[PDB]
Amino acid sequence: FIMYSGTISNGISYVNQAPSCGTVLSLKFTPGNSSLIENLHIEPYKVEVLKIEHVGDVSRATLLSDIVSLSTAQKKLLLYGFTQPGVQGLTGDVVSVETKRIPTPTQTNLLTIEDSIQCFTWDMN
């Protein structure tokens, strides 16, 4: 099980496969002034992902975040990096990620995000 930290580029996956059940993954994203994914501007954010599941025809991540809602840019930057093909459509000022396992969630906003892609999936329980 491999986690990636550093400069994000197209084809990067933050993990190489789904972690085992119960894993909480912290990812902190630091863009520049003009970082774009699929023409959408990326602002900084921190997430603690409790699980990603497939529901119907979408991937659904349940996470705790330092911010009240994620933009489409932040959703795609996160979820594309949880797929085998990895991040796509990223350009502009470099974005860095730090990815780590943490023992317990710390952030205070519970968010559910989805996209019609094939993320790596793992359960919380």
Numbering used by the authors: 78 to 202
Provide the publication's sentences verbatim:
In group B rotavirus, which causes significant diarrheal outbreaks in adults, the VP8* domain (VP8*B) surprisingly lacks sequence similarity with VP8* of group A or group C rotavirus. Here, by using the recently developed AlphaFold2 for ab initio structure prediction and validating the predicted model by determining a 1.3-Å crystal structure, we show that VP8*B exhibits a novel fold distinct from the galectin fold. This fold with a β-sheet clasping an α-helix represents a new fold for glycan recognition based on glycan array screening, which shows that VP8*B recognizes glycans containing N-acetyllactosamine moiety. Despite the novel fold, based on our glycan screening study, it is likely that VP8*B, similar to the VP8* of RVA and RVC, retains the same functionality of mediating the initial cell attachment by recognizing specific glycans in the gut.
As a representative VP8*B, the amino acid sequence of a human RVB, isolated from a gastroenteritis outbreak in India32, was expressed and purified for structure determination by X-ray crystallography. We used the well-ordered region of VP8*B (residues 83–192) in the AlphaFold2-predicted fold as a search model for MR, and determined the crystal structure of native VP8*B at 1.3-Å resolution. The crystallographic asymmetric unit contains two VP8*B molecules in addition to a short peptide. Although we purified and crystallized the recombinant VP8*B containing residues 65–233 of VP4, only the residues F78-N202 are observed in the crystal structure. The electron density of the N- and C-terminal residues are not observed due to their flexibility or a proteolytic cleavage that may have occurred during crystallization. The small peptide with four residues could be the protease cleavage product co-crystallized with the globular portion of the VP8*B. The electron density of the side chains does not match any residues of the N or C terminus of VP8*B, possibly due to heterogeneity of the short peptide and the lack of sequence specificity of the peptide-binding. The VP8*B structure contains seven β-strands and one α-helix. Five of these β-strands form a twisted antiparallel β-sheet that surrounds a central α-helix. Structural comparison of the two shows a high degree of similarity between the models with a Cα RMSD of 0.398 Å and 0.403 Å with the two VP8*B molecules in the asymmetric unit, respectively. Interestingly, the side chain of Q195 also interacts with His131 that is present in different conformations in the predicted and experimental models, suggesting that subtle changes in solution may affect glycan-binding during virus infection.
